[PDB]
Amino acid sequence: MTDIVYDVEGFRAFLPKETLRWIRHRELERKVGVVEKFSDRVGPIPVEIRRRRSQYGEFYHAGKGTTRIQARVSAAMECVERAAAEPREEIIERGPEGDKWTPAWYRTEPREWVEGVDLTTREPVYVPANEVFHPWLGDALPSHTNGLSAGRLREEAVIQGLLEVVERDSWSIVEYFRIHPPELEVHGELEELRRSLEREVGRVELRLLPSRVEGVYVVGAVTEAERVEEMVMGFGASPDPEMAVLRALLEVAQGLSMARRGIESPPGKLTPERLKRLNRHWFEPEGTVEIDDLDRVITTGSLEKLTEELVERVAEAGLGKVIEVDLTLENLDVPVVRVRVTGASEYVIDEARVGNMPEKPPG
Ligand SMILES: Nc1ncnc2c1ncn2[C@@H]1O[C@H](COP(=O)(O)OP(=O)(O)O)[C@@H](O)[C@H]1O
Ligand SMILES: [Mg+2]
Structure with a gap:
């Protein structure tokens, strides 16, 4: 414990x-x-x-x-x-x-x-x-x-790695089916952060992605900006929807830092308005969700329990096997793992990594 x-x-x-x-x-x-x-x-x-x-x-x-x-x-x-x-x-x-x-x-x-x-x-x-x-x-x-993922403990890294896999599964589902996820409405400190980041660009938009794992929420943040390279996306996944929002916003800030330094990650220059049109599913949300309406299914006590509960929910999701590979270096005593979920979608990384896909979008 x-x-x-x-x-x-x-x-x-x-x-x-x-x-x-x-x-x-x-x-x-x-x-x-x-x-x-x-x-x-x-x-x-x-x-x-x-x-x-x-x-x-x-x-x-x-x-x-x-x-x-x-x-x-x-x-x-x-x-x-x-x-x-x-x-x-x-x-x-x-x-x-x-x-x-x-x-x-x-x-x-x-x-x-x-x-x-x-x-x-x-x-x-x-x-x-x-x-x-x-x-x-x-x-x-x-x-x-x-x-x-790395952590101070293997459980930290397992939790982080697994949440990331769920996050990209949700994002892959949205892109594969071109789902229009609902806007997610936030208050207090999270709303102030969103507004504060919005002052850097044109718009910062929040979305609740469809999660295929119960108890885990996935949030996307998208930007509109007058410079096209500053139109970035951020994502977060957590049993705590507030953490999921925070993670997405932090990824946007990271994205903007990278773009302003001209650092990239995987033909002619697009216009901001055309980027919007190519990404209509992100910019035209279907419905609205209030953050306070989201149930806390998995409440966070101990690291061991949280790990177990997250693994259980992913194992139940119809996404194949949950595999952990130890990557801790002998010299650096730092816990590192690779988490693979055998039928989770990684479509956003590679079009061939479809994973377990239903015939219809999850309604
Ligand atoms: N406070 C922390 N203690 C130990 N490891 C951390 C901590 N914060 C982040 N990490 C690890 O550093 C790496 C980058 O973390 P971060 O930028 O927070 O999120 P992401 O995992 O989405 O990139 C990950 O391997 C993560 O597990
Ligand atoms: Mg990582």
């Missing part, structure tokens, strides 16, 4: 100030190849940028938070998870004995595997290296970082 002592940007067993002190003492950023740091503030939101070097090249990573401390923790741990996700021959198996997850798109049996755990059955299951590591170049589809 590990208490959640912090639940602003995510569910944490330590205060961000403690974690930052710990990151600094352990020299994690240096050890993970951080060579440059930048501090931004987008309206009221601190954003942190890291330039990182590895054998794979030079990369920009970002962190953010409601406080400068959390943004600096977020940026550091982002760098750590990416270093952990780099291919590691140590944990690759080639002639594995046991259960295997073989995704639909494999025309031939994959050769490299990593041992994971089925979080429903607690049985071992082998996962292809291309579904664990990044970058991995051998296979039919590109590798990616959906479900990759």
